[PDB]
Amino acid sequence: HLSKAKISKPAPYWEGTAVIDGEFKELKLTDYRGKYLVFFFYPLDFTFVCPTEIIAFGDRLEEFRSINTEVVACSVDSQFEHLAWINTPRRQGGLGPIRIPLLSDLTHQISKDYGVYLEDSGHTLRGLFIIDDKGILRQITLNDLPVGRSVDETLRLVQAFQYTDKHGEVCPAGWKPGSETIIPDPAGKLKYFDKLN
Amino acid sequence: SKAKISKPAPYWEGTAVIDGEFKELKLTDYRGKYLVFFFYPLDFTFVCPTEIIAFGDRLEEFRSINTEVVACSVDSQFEHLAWINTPRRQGGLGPIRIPLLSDLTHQISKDYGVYLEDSGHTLRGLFIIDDKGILRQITLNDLPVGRSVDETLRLVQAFQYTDKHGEVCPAGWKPGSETIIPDPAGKLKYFDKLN
Amino acid sequence: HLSKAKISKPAPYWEGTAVIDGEFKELKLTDYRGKYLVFFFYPLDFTFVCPTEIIAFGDRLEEFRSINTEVVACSVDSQFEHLAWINTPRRQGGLGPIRIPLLSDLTHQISKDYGVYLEDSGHTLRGLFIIDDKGILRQITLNDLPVGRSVDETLRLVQAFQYTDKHGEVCPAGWKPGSETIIPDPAGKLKYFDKLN
Amino acid sequence: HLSKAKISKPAPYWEGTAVIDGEFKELKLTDYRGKYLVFFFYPLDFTFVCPTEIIAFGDRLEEFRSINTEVVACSVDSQFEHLAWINTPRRQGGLGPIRIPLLSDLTHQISKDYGVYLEDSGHTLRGLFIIDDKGILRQITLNDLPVGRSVDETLRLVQAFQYTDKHGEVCPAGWKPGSETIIPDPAGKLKYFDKLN
Amino acid sequence: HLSKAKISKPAPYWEGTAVIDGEFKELKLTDYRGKYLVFFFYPLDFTFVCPTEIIAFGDRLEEFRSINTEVVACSVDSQFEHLAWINTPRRQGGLGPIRIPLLSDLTHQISKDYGVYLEDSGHTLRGLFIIDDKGILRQITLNDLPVGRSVDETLRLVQAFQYTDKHGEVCPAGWKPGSETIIPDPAGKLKYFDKLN
Amino acid sequence: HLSKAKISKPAPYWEGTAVIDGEFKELKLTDYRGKYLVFFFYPLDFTFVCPTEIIAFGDRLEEFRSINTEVVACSVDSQFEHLAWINTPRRQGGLGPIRIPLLSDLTHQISKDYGVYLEDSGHTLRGLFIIDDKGILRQITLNDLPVGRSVDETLRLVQAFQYTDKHGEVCPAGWKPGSETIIPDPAGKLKYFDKLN
Amino acid sequence: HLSKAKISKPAPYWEGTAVIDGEFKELKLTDYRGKYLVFFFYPLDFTFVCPTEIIAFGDRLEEFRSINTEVVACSVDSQFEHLAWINTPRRQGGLGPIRIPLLSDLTHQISKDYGVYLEDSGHTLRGLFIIDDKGILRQITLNDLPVGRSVDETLRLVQAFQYTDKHGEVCPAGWKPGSETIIPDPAGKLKYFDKLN
Amino acid sequence: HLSKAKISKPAPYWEGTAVIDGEFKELKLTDYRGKYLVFFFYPLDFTFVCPTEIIAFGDRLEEFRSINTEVVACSVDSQFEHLAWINTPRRQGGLGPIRIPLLSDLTHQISKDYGVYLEDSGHTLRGLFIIDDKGILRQITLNDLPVGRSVDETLRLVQAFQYTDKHGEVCPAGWKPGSETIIPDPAGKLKYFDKLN
Amino acid sequence: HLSKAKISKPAPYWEGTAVIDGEFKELKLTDYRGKYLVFFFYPLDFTFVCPTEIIAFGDRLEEFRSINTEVVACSVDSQFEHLAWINTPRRQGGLGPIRIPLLSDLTHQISKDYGVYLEDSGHTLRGLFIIDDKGILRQITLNDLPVGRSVDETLRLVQAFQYTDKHGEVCPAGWKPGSETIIPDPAGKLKYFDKLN
Amino acid sequence: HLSKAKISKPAPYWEGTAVIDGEFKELKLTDYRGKYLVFFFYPLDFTFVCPTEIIAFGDRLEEFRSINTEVVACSVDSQFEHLAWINTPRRQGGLGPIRIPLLSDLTHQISKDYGVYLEDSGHTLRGLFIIDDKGILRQITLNDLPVGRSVDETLRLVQAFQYTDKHGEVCPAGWKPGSETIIPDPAGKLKYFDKLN
């Protein structure tokens, strides 16, 4: 199993046609430099878990934008299908109007670069990538088809990475804003471990 | 990496510390149960003990849903045991009920695609493996940020639910939430009701 | 530039999920043995020329069925997209109910086997294949994207191939049922050439 | 199966000896730049369907020339055979005098570049190619041996490609001059679809 | 430069369609076992030297058949062309009725096996082969395009090979029936050399 | 089976030690530019047919020199053997004095370049080559071991190639000086074919 | 990945993180140029023979430093483990404070370069290397796991190499300071051999 | 740099001619099964350090034999040289009285198998191997040319391996008979570390 | 430089046509089993040193036959040349009276197998091989072209090999029948060395 | 079986340590430029035929030096062994003082370059090489182990090669100074052959 997506390395470059505010526009990974990016793939337009994930992120977009973070979704469907899906009512399993870009990957090049393409199925699994403001890949979350991801966990992870970027302390298991962190040194670590126990 | 979602999780075997003793442990020992199998970078470091303890102190939440937990690093079994015998207040683990698997040769780490060639240890990679030995979920964190027991629980529960019912789990699903019939007509029960 | 589609050789085997009467069904090339098959690819669901070709064949399907000929359409879109497109009114560029199976080629395997896949675009061009009842490929028609195919011409070709299969004769340029044909030998041919000259 | 002939790419260059106005002349693909070109192969001089196709295009040549289009025929026969066939009466299965060039491909190089050469037979199948004024290949039509092509369909295609070149609307299935066309975008397309339905 | 034609070895096998007494028939090299065969290639039907060679052998065929020798001619032209050429009057550069089979080699496989195919021209040079009753190649005569072969020389050679096949002795330069031969032995050869000197 | 001797291409270059008027001299193919060259191989000094061929050419040398043509013979024997053979009386199967250079090819390099070397025997067959004044190979005549070549035919051929070189008409089967030739043109050729028939 | 450690060649370069007086420091082989270096690997922190070796050298360090020799130990454990082991009481199988750098080789690159890595075990055997002030490898001692090395023998060897470096006389079996040495010359050697015997 | 000698694996098989009690005898590694073997190479007969090593081990052979251990020495010299050297008095740099076999390795096969051959010099460095009674290699000691090995250290090592083989406790740095050993268990080890500290 | 002739191995097999008692016969290396064979190549019939060598060995053949040894000579010349050279008087540089076989190696296979072929010259150097009664090659003597070999040295060598075959003592430099020989053992050799000194 | 030693080509370069006048010196083939060199290998110091060969040349050395010819001997033994052997009395099979350099070839490189190395034995056979003053190899003499070479024959060959270098003449079988020689040309040779016969 291959992939160019490697944590602590620059996220693999991508560019393509996206639907943005109902129109076709060219979108590039580099458009997002200077901001964190939640870049996630979903299997297929007009299916089941997928709309719920796209809608979940879209409807909570301000929780990301308020922390200098953007969100882009991608699938192997065409831009025409993305737009048709946006124009399908939510009650019919459509997206309705959406504020996050829907990127099209008809050739599968982007999916393969990110290691999320399913050769037997001709679409991706549920792969989500957290990329920092410097374009470095920090986190990879891959789900099998029948189980959707979590916006809340994605937010926690974004906050965690921004926190450690800024402060140089590290984040324990389950860390959320306000939680105790650790000075990553054999002596400094004791402040955390003695206070906790 | 041999770790591919929807395929058999790559076989592994090695020496682990279990109840303070050295024991040979094999992936196939867990068939019939879900397994949360996770790597952590290094004994005697910082985020790592918090992760092992977080899972360890909540182990019964897993065992009660037919799920086991195993942790692995490139450290030796002697180091694992010394770390267990180090007080939590000193950044140690204290007694622990989760097996600590040793991967000195790096073979297991490489098979799971979590080995860092530049560093000589793993990143924070967690794998959810079902009772049939099929890999269902991969979570990989860069070094500075720990994983989440809450999210791991949610995922195991979701996969067990979808295994049983064949309905699929929306974004953010937790026990008691609405699920979807994966059928062009059936799905409307979910989409219509929600909206 | 490669392909497995060779005229006078067995048409490359295919199988996949198709929409048939609003339901997802597995469909195989071999299901059509015993009958002529018009098997055509079109670029993309929810686009422009494509629906007009599918509707043109669909609305004239009995002209094919009455001559022991079936019609199957294929694209790189998913079965869910095919069904959503069927459920889109014709006035909005949808298909409406359709009696031609719509085959899904998400992996691009079928398209590549037939040599109609566009690597730069992630979809096929307008490729149509006429396959006889023995499974042998008899005719290949490839159009660039902007120009739709012709049901009249396709029908004429099916009739011609069926006619030459049955009789010891070959069909001159522009032949339609009822037109003069030629006996393919140095002496027999003169009955044709003397007649019309 | 291999070939250099790819739709939307430059038609493979060719050059050779042709019979033109009863004389041997060198002829090149690039001689037709600035005009559309119907370039077609036929199996064999002194056979059956072939003369009918050559005669059909030749006798209707003005229908092509009046729309800035030329026609060239090609086979694996020699220029001496082409000329002897021209000097054979139509009632004997000859061509009689002819106004389209008859290109010779004795080495099979041109046939192979166009993917129409039959290795087991030592001649071509019925392959026809429509090449635009910029030298780009737009259309490929390949028939098995028993069935002749259609001058009328060939004209329809040339007209359609010239129309879409000029207007940037696209041509529905069965389009002929005077027919409705489609604006190729998600909103503009509704002019066509709402009107027709 | 490659070839399978090797003197003193079995002549390379061939089989194909020939025109024989106005009909198309399958012909094989092995059809001629038990007789000497003069098997010759000529460049092109409807050309200049070629018919003179075919006619020269043809009109003297009984001089070959009276010494148990058959003659076969072959070119890269089709059987249809061979027949049309036969049906062309000699005064127009045709063959008229011919008793020598005309083999067709459209694929060029026979020509290439015999090493006489011109890659730059798409036809053969003037290559003649003398094959004995055991199928062993005994003589190869290859002429550039402008110069015809000789029936007299070909007859001399066939007679010489038959003579040496039958008797112990070998044939000096210029040998014709009735000429002195040589005993191929350091002592025996002296009968010849002493006599002539 | 390979070779560098290709008709209508430059004869393969050779150089070596020859016996010329009883002396050892270095000789080169290029020494013969500006003249036709009959270059011939023979199997073995002190054998049977070989001396008859060398003598047949040598004794009629002036018939070649009067038409600007030279003759060179070659074998795999040494120059020392050539000279000893020259010094052997004709009545003993020797050559006697001779004005044709005898070229030595001990390494077999020249023989292999001309495709006349017999791997099983360690000497050449009877291969004769006609090379024109421009160094282009025009004719190849290869005989099996038991049958000698013809000086008359070789002369006829040289005369023919020289004629066609000069006049650009072509020589029919059996042409000799004074015979009718053909203008190589579909119209021009009728002067010959009408006259003859 | 072959061993690069060759006696009489430059010791393979290494660099890494070491614990030195309780702190993490980058350490390089080249930091030791100008002095002899005893560079030794041990299997595993927190085991059995290993601490006894580190302590044996550690406690006798001045015996090395007084002969201008440094000592460095290395294993496949991390710097964090080295530090934790140093902070473990000797009574519990720990090191206590230590004046020898503990080098970490987590990636195994160094161990493999020195040929001491055990592929089946994931750690080194007991390999000790003596490297001179010019960086040349002079001595290799490899022990299987259950048997510890000797500080006495190590000292003896360092002294012998320094003696022979200085004087160019060579050191007999069992040499210690004050022992007889040999002039490496066929005549000079007799001073040793005669005195001894 | 390669070798077949690997600690904890079977020592590479060897066999060859040795001088034993003044006579040439074939000797095999397998002759020593059931006993420990100190197998050592030395550079060259008639040199300097080498005789002192052979003499040192030989003169102390009973200290090995009384612990079920044999000693064999090997160099790239011939058996004839070994014997002449034995017949040379010690005062002349010869071996004089001797009881250990001197194995000859003229082809360098054995030296290369053991990884002690010096390609630049044509002889071996000072490599010593300790092989157990099961034929497993336990210890490797390699010295550069100017410095001899130690009989006392070799004895210490043989005794240590025999002790660990027997008792399953392990030997600390500098162990000698009578010294403290360690139980290789995280609990059992404490008996040693608490006692010593 | 390559060859199959290796001292102490079976001499490479050969077979071919030889001149024996003025007749052509097939001859094989194995015809000589049970006898020693002096097998030698010479460059070229009708040259200079070569006849003196053939004559020298031949005229003294009884000195070989009376010690169970035969002699065979070989060159790259033909059997016809060998015979012609035999029939040439010695006073003219011929062989005249002869009793040793002259082997022919036209293909150079035998010469190449024995490593005596000169690729630049097309003949052998002066190579002589002494092969024993068991067919094992014992001695190789290779001379550059200008210098002849010695019958007396060859006899000395044949006698030496037979003596050592029979007695198992070895022959000192310059040994001839009746000379002292050596017992090849460190003690036995002293009989020779003490006596002679 | 390969080698770099080719007659008529530059002798393969060598350099190494030799014993000269009882001392070790580096010696190079190029050191002998301007003089003939007899360069010979012998199997083993302290053996049987070998000393007799070294002594036989050594005791007649002035017969070589007086004709500008040097002698060098070489074996796979060390320089230390050579010197020890020199210091062994002749009556004990030693060399005693010697004026011929004894070259050491411990690595076997020189022996392999000259094709005299025995892979199965780890030493050379008895190979002798005569190298002229320009460094060209002129003669190779290879003996199996049990039979020594000849100083008489070696001197004869050196004399002959020197003679043929100086004069335009070649040396018959068995030539010694004062013997008749041949002028190597077809006419001049007769002066030798007529006189002898």
PDB file of C-alpha atoms in Angstrom, chain C residues 50-141:
ATOM      1  CA  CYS C  50     -24.880  12.883 -22.730  1.00  0.00           C
ATOM      2  CA  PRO C  51     -28.523  12.951 -21.619  1.00  0.00           C
ATOM      3  CA  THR C  52     -29.641  13.642 -25.201  1.00  0.00           C
ATOM      4  CA  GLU C  53     -27.852  10.497 -26.417  1.00  0.00           C
ATOM      5  CA  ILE C  54     -29.280   8.320 -23.647  1.00  0.00           C
ATOM      6  CA  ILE C  55     -32.791   9.654 -24.227  1.00  0.00           C
ATOM      7  CA  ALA C  56     -32.468   9.336 -28.007  1.00  0.00           C
ATOM      8  CA  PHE C  57     -31.648   5.632 -27.750  1.00  0.00           C
ATOM      9  CA  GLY C  58     -34.098   5.061 -24.901  1.00  0.00           C
ATOM     10  CA  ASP C  59     -37.066   6.594 -26.667  1.00  0.00           C
ATOM     11  CA  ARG C  60     -36.348   4.467 -29.756  1.00  0.00           C
ATOM     12  CA  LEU C  61     -35.449   1.295 -27.896  1.00  0.00           C
ATOM     13  CA  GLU C  62     -38.223  -0.776 -29.493  1.00  0.00           C
ATOM     14  CA  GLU C  63     -36.651  -0.198 -32.911  1.00  0.00           C
ATOM     15  CA  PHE C  64     -33.673  -2.123 -31.526  1.00  0.00           C
ATOM     16  CA  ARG C  65     -35.504  -4.724 -29.496  1.00  0.00           C
ATOM     17  CA  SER C  66     -37.613  -5.649 -32.459  1.00  0.00           C
ATOM     18  CA  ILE C  67     -34.419  -6.680 -34.256  1.00  0.00           C
ATOM     19  CA  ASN C  68     -33.073  -8.741 -31.387  1.00  0.00           C
ATOM     20  CA  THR C  69     -30.771  -5.931 -30.283  1.00  0.00           C
ATOM     21  CA  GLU C  70     -30.202  -4.550 -26.786  1.00  0.00           C
ATOM     22  CA  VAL C  71     -28.660  -1.249 -25.724  1.00  0.00           C
ATOM     23  CA  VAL C  72     -26.430  -0.567 -22.696  1.00  0.00           C
ATOM     24  CA  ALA C  73     -24.897   2.771 -21.676  1.00  0.00           C
ATOM     25  CA  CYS C  74     -21.872   3.216 -19.431  1.00  0.00           C
ATOM     26  CA  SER C  75     -19.997   6.052 -17.725  1.00  0.00           C
ATOM     27  CA  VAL C  76     -17.440   6.572 -14.970  1.00  0.00           C
ATOM     28  CA  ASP C  77     -20.226   7.798 -12.631  1.00  0.00           C
ATOM     29  CA  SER C  78     -21.613   5.757  -9.721  1.00  0.00           C
ATOM     30  CA  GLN C  79     -24.862   3.816  -9.743  1.00  0.00           C
ATOM     31  CA  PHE C  80     -26.179   6.311  -7.162  1.00  0.00           C
ATOM     32  CA  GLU C  81     -25.537   9.160  -9.585  1.00  0.00           C
ATOM     33  CA  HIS C  82     -27.200   7.247 -12.431  1.00  0.00           C
ATOM     34  CA  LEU C  83     -30.299   6.759 -10.278  1.00  0.00           C
ATOM     35  CA  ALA C  84     -30.331  10.388  -9.082  1.00  0.00           C
ATOM     36  CA  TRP C  85     -30.071  11.461 -12.721  1.00  0.00           C
ATOM     37  CA  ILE C  86     -32.950   9.209 -13.709  1.00  0.00           C
ATOM     38  CA  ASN C  87     -34.961  10.861 -10.900  1.00  0.00           C
ATOM     39  CA  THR C  88     -34.164  14.312 -12.351  1.00  0.00           C
ATOM     40  CA  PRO C  89     -36.825  15.709 -14.739  1.00  0.00           C
ATOM     41  CA  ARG C  90     -35.918  15.985 -18.420  1.00  0.00           C
ATOM     42  CA  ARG C  91     -36.644  19.729 -18.281  1.00  0.00           C
ATOM     43  CA  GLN C  92     -33.775  20.113 -15.821  1.00  0.00           C
ATOM     44  CA  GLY C  93     -31.460  18.035 -18.004  1.00  0.00           C
ATOM     45  CA  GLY C  94     -32.301  14.751 -16.287  1.00  0.00           C
ATOM     46  CA  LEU C  95     -33.135  11.417 -17.884  1.00  0.00           C
ATOM     47  CA  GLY C  96     -36.538  10.604 -16.442  1.00  0.00           C
ATOM     48  CA  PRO C  97     -37.568   6.942 -16.364  1.00  0.00           C
ATOM     49  CA  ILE C  98     -35.354   4.932 -18.738  1.00  0.00           C
ATOM     50  CA  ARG C  99     -35.401   1.345 -20.010  1.00  0.00           C
ATOM     51  CA  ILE C 100     -31.719   1.182 -21.017  1.00  0.00           C
ATOM     52  CA  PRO C 101     -29.413  -0.168 -18.297  1.00  0.00           C
ATOM     53  CA  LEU C 102     -26.974   2.458 -17.017  1.00  0.00           C
ATOM     54  CA  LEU C 103     -23.663   0.767 -16.188  1.00  0.00           C
ATOM     55  CA  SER C 104     -21.255   2.239 -13.624  1.00  0.00           C
ATOM     56  CA  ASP C 105     -17.461   2.190 -14.273  1.00  0.00           C
ATOM     57  CA  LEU C 106     -16.067   3.903 -11.157  1.00  0.00           C
ATOM     58  CA  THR C 107     -12.684   2.128 -11.397  1.00  0.00           C
ATOM     59  CA  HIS C 108     -12.287   3.057 -15.091  1.00  0.00           C
ATOM     60  CA  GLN C 109     -11.401  -0.574 -15.857  1.00  0.00           C
ATOM     61  CA  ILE C 110     -14.144  -1.082 -18.447  1.00  0.00           C
ATOM     62  CA  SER C 111     -13.456   2.283 -20.109  1.00  0.00           C
ATOM     63  CA  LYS C 112      -9.748   1.523 -20.357  1.00  0.00           C
ATOM     64  CA  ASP C 113     -10.402  -1.958 -21.755  1.00  0.00           C
ATOM     65  CA  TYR C 114     -12.506  -0.312 -24.497  1.00  0.00           C
ATOM     66  CA  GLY C 115      -9.881   2.368 -25.083  1.00  0.00           C
ATOM     67  CA  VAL C 116     -12.281   5.244 -24.454  1.00  0.00           C
ATOM     68  CA  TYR C 117     -10.891   6.594 -21.177  1.00  0.00           C
ATOM     69  CA  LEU C 118      -9.430  10.119 -21.169  1.00  0.00           C
ATOM     70  CA  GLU C 119      -6.485  10.151 -18.754  1.00  0.00           C
ATOM     71  CA  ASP C 120      -6.395  13.963 -18.549  1.00  0.00           C
ATOM     72  CA  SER C 121     -10.131  14.280 -17.880  1.00  0.00           C
ATOM     73  CA  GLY C 122     -11.093  11.343 -15.664  1.00  0.00           C
ATOM     74  CA  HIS C 123     -13.985  10.276 -17.892  1.00  0.00           C
ATOM     75  CA  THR C 124     -14.635   8.735 -21.319  1.00  0.00           C
ATOM     76  CA  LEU C 125     -15.211  10.298 -24.709  1.00  0.00           C
ATOM     77  CA  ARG C 126     -18.277   9.374 -26.771  1.00  0.00           C
ATOM     78  CA  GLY C 127     -17.432   5.783 -27.706  1.00  0.00           C
ATOM     79  CA  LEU C 128     -20.006   3.372 -29.153  1.00  0.00           C
ATOM     80  CA  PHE C 129     -19.455  -0.316 -29.857  1.00  0.00           C
ATOM     81  CA  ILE C 130     -21.579  -2.729 -31.860  1.00  0.00           C
ATOM     82  CA  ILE C 131     -21.162  -6.295 -30.662  1.00  0.00           C
ATOM     83  CA  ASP C 132     -22.825  -9.241 -32.389  1.00  0.00           C
ATOM     84  CA  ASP C 133     -24.775 -12.150 -30.881  1.00  0.00           C
ATOM     85  CA  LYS C 134     -21.591 -14.254 -30.833  1.00  0.00           C
ATOM     86  CA  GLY C 135     -19.874 -11.575 -28.747  1.00  0.00           C
ATOM     87  CA  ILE C 136     -17.646 -10.376 -31.601  1.00  0.00           C
ATOM     88  CA  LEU C 137     -16.897  -6.630 -31.911  1.00  0.00           C
ATOM     89  CA  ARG C 138     -18.064  -5.408 -35.348  1.00  0.00           C
ATOM     90  CA  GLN C 139     -18.013  -1.606 -35.226  1.00  0.00           C
ATOM     91  CA  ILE C 140     -16.391   1.193 -33.231  1.00  0.00           C
ATOM     92  CA  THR C 141     -17.580   4.807 -33.270  1.00  0.00           C
TER      93      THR C 141
END
